[PDB]
Design a protein around this nucleic acid. Sequence first.
RNA 1: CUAGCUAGCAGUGGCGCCCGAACAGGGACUUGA
Lengths: 402, 542
Amino acid sequence: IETVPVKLKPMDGPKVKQWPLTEEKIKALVEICTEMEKEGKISKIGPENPYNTPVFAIKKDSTKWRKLVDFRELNKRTQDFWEVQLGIPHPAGLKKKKSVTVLDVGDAYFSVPLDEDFRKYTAFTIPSINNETPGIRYQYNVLPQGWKGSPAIFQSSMTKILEPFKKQNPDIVIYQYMDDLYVGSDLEIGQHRTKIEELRQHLLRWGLTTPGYELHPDKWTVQPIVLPEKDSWTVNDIQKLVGKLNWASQIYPGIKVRQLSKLLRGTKALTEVIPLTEEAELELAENREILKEPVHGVYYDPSKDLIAEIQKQGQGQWTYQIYQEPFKNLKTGKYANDVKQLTEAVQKITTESIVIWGKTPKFKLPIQKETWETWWTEYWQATWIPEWEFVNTPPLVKLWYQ
Amino acid sequence: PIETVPVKLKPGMDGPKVKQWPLTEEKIKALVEICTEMEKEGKISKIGPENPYNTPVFAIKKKDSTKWRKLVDFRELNKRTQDFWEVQLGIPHPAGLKKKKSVTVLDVGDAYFSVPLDEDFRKYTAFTIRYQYNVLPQGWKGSPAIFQSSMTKILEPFKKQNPDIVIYQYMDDLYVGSDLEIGQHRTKIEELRQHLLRWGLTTPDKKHQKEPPFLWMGYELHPDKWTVQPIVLPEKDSWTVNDICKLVGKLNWASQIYPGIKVRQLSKLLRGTKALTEVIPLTEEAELELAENREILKEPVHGVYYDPSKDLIAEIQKQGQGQWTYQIYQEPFKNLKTGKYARMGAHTNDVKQLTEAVQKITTESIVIWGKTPKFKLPIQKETWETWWTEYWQATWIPEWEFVNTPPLVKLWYQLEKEPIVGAETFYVDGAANRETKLGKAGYVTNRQKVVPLTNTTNQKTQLQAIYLALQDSGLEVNIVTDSQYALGIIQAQPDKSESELVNQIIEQLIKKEKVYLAWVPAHKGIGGNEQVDKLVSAGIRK
RNA sequence: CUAGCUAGCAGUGGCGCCCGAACAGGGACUUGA
């Protein structure tokens, strides 16, 4: 081991608090931390360090209770190191594949030592129900999970160990964003699973236990904003469509209501039907054909930040939008208890964004802060944690879809 | 022989060079003797001519007037000292306590001084008059943290010896109990006393263990029950901000456990009060509120402990005026505790406040007990499901059921997601000026109206316009507007807010059985849109 | 070093008041309807 010296930006380490937990989780935390300390991965500490980092418990495919840390603040503060010193590339063929697979090798990170001057910035504590006991603090004497610097430094030995199989499977591509891994596979699903098992054995060769699961990017496309095609058109429908078109004009400059506005020159009732003239129908068909086409005049920038907006329609139907600048959408789609579906939806959207751009965007959820902070751990199943916030939404962007 | 904690100073700093204040000539001997007494015990080192530093000194005669004792202030060093982690940021609660048959408690005097200090850091104890505290001083920033950490690591082996027992520690007292007879309890207490004397602590055998209920933050910790300290109230007419603070703090300490406790009026009575001797005339509302609080307090009540085996229950009995309550019990009438949640966004509804209160109670139960019970809410399912399904957000709650305990909760009106036949179209709009504020607005039929205003904004102009329009319209109507503000506000389906304008809006809306609405742009020539724009812009646009 | 040569510390829980940091809208510079 040659621990690379970690040095935070010449900004102090975080001291965030810890939201309440449950005994059902505290028991699991204690029984896992016992072994973690027995195996020289951690050690008990006192108040000598002022720092502190959130901690929690989780529970697919098993009933175990793993854990991880919220290094969001830590990563946002120590970006430079892993962002510039030892960067990572981002291929593009993975999305053109048939199927993919995601792994998790946190155990591999749990088999390496770590510097001592940086452990103080890894203060992680567990709570005590009813404040009966002071915080049982600990320290990470090894590579932690969720810290994207650990993979940035381990990639060397990781690739050195991966050497054997990749030469035999050149068509396959690999990405190491975080504790999780990815694979490029443009072959049969059966062959995909056979090679996945082969790689699992290649990992077990060094004692790496790793028993949704897979995914397919080919089916992913943009959500075509489509208008209704009826034989009788009332006023209210035309008003809704005109509002939608005016709000969307910021995307497609080729949107006009000249032939339509004329029909509105007459302030009549709502249920009365009006025929769509050929000129009006011509302009409507032109706008429709323009919408289905993709975006023209946009791009992707890895230096700037990303946004991950979300909305809701009803009956468990949700939407999602991604963009760097306002109204510069890079992708859309569809996806259809109320918090479980939201959690899996954000997971799916972030996975899509990562396999496309290799970066985690910022989110905007339409809910209060305490409710999410409390109930997001229930159905969570991943090991990566992005940023987030909370916003109020008007009934205008909702018109992006039905 | 306990092990200390390595401690350093802030980046590139040292001890502050100061001159100790001049003092009297009668406490000096009375405090020099105290210093020599602390020295002889083997707790301080006197090395003056070496340390080039200094610290302040004080002579105090605090409560229990016996003599002028010593005090020191670290206000000049607490900031220079390197930062530390604040461990205890909360406190326990009587509601979250369990059933311990054999209860007890253990305190230690001068325990702060019963812990050594890192000799590299003991140099920063230049107590001139010089004396260098060989142990932890008083008024220190983190000393309680090291204290609790030492206590925890010392009891760790004791916990391993008898993990079945539970301990409730604190600053200096060790609240402990079990579910056995006396003999075994005293045997374990002597074992703990020996385990502690192994490191030099103190414990008598004549303290208060059954003489309780204890005196802890103003509580009554009975053996098989508990409650807050018996409280009283003044019986005069004048009310000064000092007496205010007093009674407010008292009734607040009482409200966290007692039901039917209202302070909103007395709280409102303080907004704007800044002087120190304001004899406020108690408004009739505050007078009757105090009378009712007294009546509720004229009879005592004893809280109940917690049982891990048996589950708990949550229930609410709303009182109105947008204020809420909540009761927690494991059995009928066995109320553990209660509280209050009445915080108001400018606009809000009933189910919103209900959701906020129930999620706050859930967080409280988690931080106290670590779970949530089956809630008992006075509202039927269809209302809540329709609400959270047709709302523009997501709101989830655990299992619960219905309660037939009037008053209840409901939506006093509804909106339609599709136009209706037979209704009348209403192209309405309203604007004003940033200088005159005499905006004109009204409505138009498929008959038009215009009404000037005073000191209003485009938002308020359109609001008052739709108000006056509804004042004359019939039952069914399909209206349209441009201001997303009012539309989005009405979509929340609120029944109470701050501005009385929206209150009259909803009042008039209630009577109207059916209604439809939507949004359209402005300055586009949509039916009556441009017409109303031109009609209202008269004399204010150019 | 706080108050008018004289008296002057901190923590805990609450009652509060002022400022700083975040959120949604309003008034001035630059682009489109």
